[PDB]
């Protein structure tokens, strides 16, 4: 009974409302505006600048206290759209309510994909692993306080920016930690300046938090003394000068058996530092392997920059998060020993979402009707298209969302792994 205009308007409205409503993590990630809009299906590798927190100077005279910096960049690739390609039955188009139900189901699937992507990247790139052999709970005798431990590790490592930290619990651990949902929505937010800016932590729960599979690696040792330096430029094959993604660092190990993207490692005799004062901390530095390049090579998501490296220039030494470089024959100390559902937390600007409008030519082809739309609350740009197919004697509907999530500053993303007792 609906007509084409009603189809487009109702579908776009329901998609926007649902996806805005049911994405808590996608709304806790910073929205980065792409540099420009282009009609190209292959989005450019957007190089996002990341700035180190700079302490405030005190004196009247501050000669040459701004020009000297390193200005590293990080790369995000938009990739290919998240789609939802289905057939529109005559039952759905019977009235507004059925059509809204069908479009709501489609939007829920799309928001599932978005929030799953954010959660999986946070869990597989988070590198502030805090571990305990006890399940999360409220009694201090045996249970583990995940929020307090996360607070103290994010305070010892001066990554907090003196502002709030976003915590995401899996629902069971959220129940165990004694967090109530009175006068709160389903995710634990307050319905209502930002609370994060004022410095108030936000504790939430999300069912999309993945299970970090155990690691079977045993006895892995490094091969040779390796030191990493924060470089801002590199020469590509054309001879031009290209940025370097300083997050990742390739480490040569004795073997990579039983190592995967989700694993967390911590080299023995290696400690963190406060990012501002560079004071050695008691906690061992924890890194996350992101890609197993070869049988003896590993990429870890925070680059270990030694404080004692004499080769470092002062601007390079400002980017120091590890006290000593990876000398030979250090053990890796696998941390995710057991299967456990992850609890993640990150700083203000530890995950960024980039989305740009989908290039299309509306009304150019009579058969297909495309309607661009955007979701301001989450920051996603999408498209809505419908077509008639004679094979199924029914109209095809397609909802595409183009977005690319990036884990800038993986050293500020934490993973909570309770029950790692084996």
């Amino acid at each position: 009974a609906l007509n084409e205009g009603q189809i487009v308007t109702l579908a776009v409205d329901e998609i926007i409302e649902t996806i805005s409503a049911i994405t808590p993590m996608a709304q806790k990630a910073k929205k980065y505006t792409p540099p420009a809009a282009s009609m190209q299906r292959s989005s450019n590798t957007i190089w996002m600048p990341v700035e180190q927190e700079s302490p405030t100077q005190e004196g009247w005279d501050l000669t040459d206290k701004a020009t000297g910096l390193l200005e590293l960049n990080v790369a995000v690739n938009m990739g290919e759209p998240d789609n939802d390609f289905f057939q529109l039955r005559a039952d759905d188009l019977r009235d507004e309510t059925a059509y809204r139900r069908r479009i709501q189901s489609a939007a829920r699937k799309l928001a599932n994909n978005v929030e799953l992507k954010v959660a999986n990247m946070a869990a597989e790139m988070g590198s502030l692993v805090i571990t305990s052999p006890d399940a999360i709970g409220t009694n201090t005798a045996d249970a583990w306080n995940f929020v307090a431990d996360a607070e103290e590790i994010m305070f010892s490592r001066e990554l907090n920016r003196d502002m709030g930290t976003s915590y995401f619990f899996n629902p069971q651990d959220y129940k165990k930690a004694g967090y109530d949902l009175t006068k709160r929505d389903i995710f634990g937010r307050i319905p209502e300046i930002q609370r994060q800016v004022a410095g108030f932590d936000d504790v939430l729960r999300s069912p999309k938090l993945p299970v970090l599979t155990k690691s079977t690696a045993t006895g892995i040792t490094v091969s040779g003394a390796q030191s990493f330096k924060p470089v801002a430029w590199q020469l590509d094959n054309d001879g031009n000068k290209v940025n370097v993604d300083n997050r990742f660092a390739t480490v040569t190990l004795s073997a990579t058996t039983g190592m995967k993207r989700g694993d967390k490692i911590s080299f023995a005799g290696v400690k963190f530092l406060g990012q501002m004062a560079k004071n050695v901390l008691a906690q061992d530095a924890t890194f996350s392997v992101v890609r197993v390049v070869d049988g003896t090579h590993v990429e870890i998501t925070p680059k270990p920059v030694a404080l004692d490296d004499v080769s470092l220039s002062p601007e390079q030494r400002a980017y120091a998060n590890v006290n000593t470089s990876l000398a030979d024959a250090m053990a890796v100390n696998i941390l995710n020993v057991k299967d456990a559902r992850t609890n993640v937390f990150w700083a203000d600007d530890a995950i960024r979402i980039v989305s740009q409008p989908i290039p299309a030519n509306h009304e150019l082809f009579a058969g297909m009707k495309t309607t661009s739309f955007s979701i301001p609350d989450v920051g996603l740009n999408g498209i809505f298209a419908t077509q008639g197919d004679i094979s199924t004697l029914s109209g095809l509907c397609r909802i595409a969302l183009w977005y690319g999530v990036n884990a800038t500053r993986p050293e500020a993303i934490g993973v909570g792994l309770p029950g790692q007792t084996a």
Partner: peptide, 30 residues
């Protein structure tokens, strides 16, 4: 009534195909 007029405007905007007007009128109604 105001509610009836706003709902009629929403229906007309939806039938036309203007998503932005429909969303603004829905916000006004709520």
């Amino acid at each position: 009534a105001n509610k009836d007029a706003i709902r009629k405007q929403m229906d007309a905007a939806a039938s036309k195909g203007d998503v932005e007007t429909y969303r603004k009128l829905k916000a006004k109604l709520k």
